[PDB]
Design an enzyme around this catalytic site. Structure first.
Site, PDB file in Angstrom:
ATOM      1  N   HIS B 166      47.309  51.702 -36.119  1.00 34.41           N
ATOM      2  CA  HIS B 166      47.870  52.060 -37.424  1.00 34.41           C
ATOM      3  C   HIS B 166      48.374  50.793 -38.103  1.00 34.41           C
ATOM      4  CE1 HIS B 166      48.765  56.021 -35.175  1.00 34.41           C
ATOM      5  NE2 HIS B 166      47.572  56.068 -35.723  1.00 34.41           N
ATOM      6  N   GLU B 169      51.990  49.467 -38.900  1.00 33.50           N
ATOM      7  CA  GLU B 169      52.915  49.252 -37.797  1.00 33.50           C
ATOM      8  C   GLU B 169      52.806  47.808 -37.304  1.00 33.50           C
ATOM      9  OE1 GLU B 169      51.940  52.300 -35.048  1.00 33.50           O
ATOM     10  OE2 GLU B 169      52.198  53.971 -36.435  1.00 33.50           O
ATOM     11  N   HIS B 259      52.669  50.654 -30.775  1.00 31.75           N
ATOM     12  CA  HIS B 259      52.780  51.414 -32.032  1.00 31.75           C
ATOM     13  C   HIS B 259      54.160  51.271 -32.675  1.00 31.75           C
ATOM     14  CE1 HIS B 259      49.013  53.861 -32.150  1.00 31.75           C
ATOM     15  NE2 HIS B 259      49.000  53.569 -30.864  1.00 31.75           N
ATOM     16  N   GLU B 335      56.519  52.889 -28.701  1.00 31.44           N
ATOM     17  CA  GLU B 335      56.913  53.072 -30.095  1.00 31.44           C
ATOM     18  C   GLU B 335      58.169  52.255 -30.318  1.00 31.44           C
ATOM     19  OE1 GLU B 335      55.143  54.583 -32.365  1.00 31.44           O
ATOM     20  OE2 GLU B 335      54.024  56.254 -31.469  1.00 31.44           O
TER      21      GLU B 335
HETATM   22 CA   LIG Z   1      51.073  54.409 -34.517  1.00 28.62          CA
END
Ligand SMILES: [Ca+2]
Ligand SMILES: [Ca+2]
Ligand SMILES: [Ca+2]
Ligand SMILES: [Ca+2]
Lengths: 376, 376, 376, 376
Positions: B166, B169, B259, B335
């Site tokens: 993504h 990010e 991420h 994350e």
């Molecule tokens: Ca992500």
């Protein structure tokens, strides 16, 4: 051909410069004549030749295991310090120098000058959480300086870190520089977390006099500072005297005395299991600390080290023991090798300031691991 | 007064520059129109005034929790990126700019350009243990580049690290830069130990097209690369297609997909417990990995995160799951927050590239903790 | 074997990657189709082999002398750029590449990306005597940024420095980078002496669009900006349009137009002797300025360069003439070589960013030499 | 409240630390008791308070004009050195210190330690055109090191640069540091142009013993080295003895003797016009050299300095005269101020290492200007 040692931390005597294949040298004993091993000198000659430098009295040094598989440290630029082909035969340490530049400095480990020390304790001042404190004078009249990191909040824990009681163990100050650089970085969460919970009292150089004098193990008058902890004096061991008194003001919740070991090519902790006040709690903090330190550093190991003390049999004149027993806290001596870590050997540089710095960082992680457990 | 976004990773539309107290702006949706949240623009005005910049369509963004307690990131010098007073009211994100210099760049997180990416994958080449490999082309014709660290010894373990599927990010690529800088330092024992036992396959930027295009979550044609892992295509998800095939050549013994999470102010792992091939061994490696990561980083925590999957209920189109299930290995998505770590809050900068870099270092330690346990 | 130019400043077209002994490429023309010479691309292949890369349309490039004795610039790390073995025969430019690393970038001169441009104009803002001013947009919508150095005292002299009207002449922006660094160092006395007497108006990049597009010589719509000074427009040449109008606000006392020359392997100034307003006074300043530059820099010379204009015969659409003629001031075009300084050859790198940075420094000394002589 | 000078270059004696509004100190005289002015010490006290430090024997210092308008130099971090509020009345020099940090170092000029000296002469060795040569020992047994820059081609011109005959004039070694850095950068054309025509013989420190001892003006046994050039000896002035003998091997085409002046707040050259071998040719080179220096550096001036010698009346025991007279060559003493350049004042730091470094750079330009005019 020239040899020289008149500078901060220098130590060599020139016996003979006649023969390029047999330059004869001797280590000068610490004051009081009871110890030596550290050497630090500069050598200049014609490049493109290979010289043999013989330290004739290596056999009379305090730790002969330290000569076995040992390679001298050297630098052309005083920045990158590498290892030289070295051998120990007939009581003499033989160093081959294939001179690539006119001038090379050769030493037992990477030196750490008083000028460098002054830069370190001056520079940390700029940090908002740092205050240095003059503890007192050494016997030569140099400064015993305490680096206080934190906000002096009395509810926080007290962490004491002392390095270089034995001046020749320069890797100790190198680690303390690494550790300070990491601790004083707010972007590091371990640092933030630690400082939220603890105040640090750090002595980057317990023995400036022995340091400048090029001693291995003693201060100006030949005292071994690590036997001075129970009955220290201004006359003989002022260096330990002021630390011990400060400790009485601050309390100690964790103690880390940073050292270097000559003979063993390993990094290891030596704890205080033999103190009369040892306990299950202290045993348990030690296991946690050792567990954390092993995870934090691949240079750490637990197979080799010193022998443990029988219960109650600790020598209470040793910092580690004296502190542990007096303040009933997690306490360790850390030993890093003059040789290399045999488990992760690096032939270009052996044990180095760079690896000592990394062990300083790993150390803060071990500490954080027990931060909530230590103290009352 | 001026607003601009025509540069690598830019994203803003100018609705109105009439009123200094109400500059009106809009985020441009990802291609395909299904997502947005990332913004990145430059603003120039007269210094010494305070401007209010209103992103009118914040309310239409993909993750509205991410606007709660969020503060925009900004920089005068493109080096130090700090947080701005921000509020979310009536579907709009309001940013106060007390302009100290004529020009300021404002963004959802610290940007990471394709020029920076090219510097990173070019520079690592100089290392003797590093080889980069062209995996193939992205849909815009940019390069999918694989950084191979190690000596390609087939007996070693395989560690795959993918970041920035993504594109918005950016903290993911920042961590990968930190991690590479540490891994490529031989003085670091964790690095030496790791490389003695493993080969690394690292993709610092899974989505260059979405990156340059200023997308939050998709590649050039609007595909969400993290649903492409089970049935990827050259037409729609070439980025994942080449990775998946390479994995089949290399095997995977540990997977780490890096991420960023919009709404939660915490760092957390999300594992692959719901895969059909989950096992006691995998459960056990996860516990060890989580244990190690908690010790390695004070920014890590395990209270908050995503919900766990019921057994067998994993979405096998997600990289973490697909890899875990296909290669039966320890696998995690990491994350890091767009906001800050609420446990160690830093109001000047919130979560930052500096902290992402530190988490890259902490990550290698977690990995080393399980290095001897993973694989066959 | 891979060829790529999809990136800022990229320029190459691939004809054939069939034969490693004859890789066939072509240079893409500038928008408008009138010019080309600048190339910039990335090549990935197998290390240990020697590849030959042939730009088949070199014979149609804008400056064919530019090819004789020219050697291509390259880098594996995008930090150090060096020359590759190159020859030009039968209209083809032939580059030899023995790949030490998998990926190499090959260009006509060291690239200077817009991201770097943004870093430069952002960083300088932190200096207390620096203000940036948004002049307006380029045709593609990027920024024309004026860097103002000084206290903005309207009584002072006005010095204007413009670089990179021709985008491929990246050395010009490298020189401005070096000039700004030195000018912003207050410990430098020439810097201090200049800012006490002058305000500086510097444009590090006159043609951002041509730059990103990989053009040699024209902006986004094929305009040669250095023929637009007399009658520019917002729709064809906004880049010049805004600078001309700013110069009218500020006045001009010294003008320096920074360029790169393809053909001559020398550094030289081209003055404005052909302008109708030429005067003894202007000719005097020019000799003072040339003398000073000869003293400031060993790379400078005055034997080779462009032929001089006849009296009155200058083209007033060229910046140097237009400015000199409009403001009756000292005005030069500086030309640095794409090749090298034949007088101080350097085979490893030829002319380079670092030499350009040094020439920026020497330029401040030359300017100081006429500081009290210029203005009114 | 603590005062300390036990360190390299330290100089102060404590009379009284009773009153914080009147701390009483004295400057220790040079060995021999004839001179003093240089001071250097560390002061620790309580932050937030303003202390007054009074050097009670300032009225007996060697250069009393040196005290008028003088401001003491200081540093909390030993990296940035700045001026403190200072006044001189009734024979006392009064320094105000409002302590922001606990520890501050106060000196007559920024110190330059022997450890730093060792770093400099070691680091430069790595350059392929640099060789260091051990000339011999100082009286205390330290090294006299000659830094040789060039290919040692005996056909080339010989340029000799000597600094710090008077130890307290640390700016001289700062200048040589800056001169070496630039001279060793091959991207600098003046550097390249010089090394194509000359070999350099540079002594960054002429008086290491005086330096470590905190002397103003004399070596270890109280000798003023700049009166020893005609009849030096190994037992009183070995420092000069070895240089004189080396000069006879190499010849001298340009001589530059780097000094610092206490009294005048200006930079100036003092030539050798009074030597019996003075000639039109020498006077011509001097004017060429002065002109070039005026152009190279805005800090240079030619209005103030020492009175000139009458024809034939020069003292030939002074280096500049002795060399000029012996080798019939261009020869100057450079004097930089302890105060500041009154023409380009800088209140925060006055004259400084950084300005000295810049003047080193300007000196190479001046030398280049006469490079083909000198020699034979
Ligand atoms: Ca992500
Ligand atoms: Ca020890
Ligand atoms: Ca041009
Ligand atoms: Ca002097």
């Amino acid at each position: 051909m020239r040899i020289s040692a008149n500078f901060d931390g220098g130590n060599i005597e020139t016996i003979s410069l006649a023969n390029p294949d047999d330059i004869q040298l001797a280590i000068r004993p610490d004051a009081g004549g009871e110890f030596y091993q550290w050497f630090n000198f500069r050598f200049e000659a014609t490049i493109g030749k290979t010289y043999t430098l013989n330290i004739l009295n290596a056999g009379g040094a305090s730790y002969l295991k330290g000569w076995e598989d040992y390679q001298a440290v050297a630098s052309y630029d005083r920045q990158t310090w590498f290892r030289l082909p070295t051998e120990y035969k007939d009581g003499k340490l033989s160093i081959s120098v294939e001179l690539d530049c006119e001038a090379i400095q050769i030493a037992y480990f990477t030196p750490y000058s008083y000028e460098r020390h002054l830069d370190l304790i001056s520079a940390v001042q700029l940090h908002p959480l740092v205050s240095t404190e003059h503890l007192g004078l050494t016997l030569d009249g140099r400064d015993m300086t305490l680096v206080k990191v934190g906000d002096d909040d009395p509810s926080k824990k007290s962490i004491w870190i002392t390095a270089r009681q034995h001046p020749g163990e320069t890797m100790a100050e190198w680690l303390v520089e690494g550790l300070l650089n990491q601790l004083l970085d707010n972007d590091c969460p371990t640092s933030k977390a630690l400082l939220d919970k603890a105040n640090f009292y750090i002595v980057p150089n317990m023995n400036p006099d022995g340091s400048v004098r090029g001693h291995l193990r003693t201060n100006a008058v030949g005292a071994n500072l690590n036997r001075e902890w129970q009955t220290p004096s201004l006359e003989r061991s002022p260096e330990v005297y002021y630390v011990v008194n400060k400790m009485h003001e601050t309390g100690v919740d964790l103690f880390y005395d940073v050292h270097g070991d000559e003979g063993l090519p390993y990094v290891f902790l030596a704890g205080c299991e033999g103190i009369p006040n040892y306990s299950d709690k202290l045993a348990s903090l030690q296991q946690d600390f050792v567990a954390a330190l092993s995870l934090a550093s691949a240079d750490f190991q637990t197979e080799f080290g010193y022998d443990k003390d029988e219960p109650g049999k600790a020598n209470l004149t040793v910092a580690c023991n004296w502190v542990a027993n007096t303040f009933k806290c997690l306490s360790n001596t850390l030993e890093m090798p003059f040789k290399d870590n045999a488990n992760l050997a690096d032939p270009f540089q052996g044990w180095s300031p760079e690896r000592s710095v990394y062990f300083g960082e790993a150390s803060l992680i071990a500490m954080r691991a027990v931060i909530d457990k230590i103290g009352q």
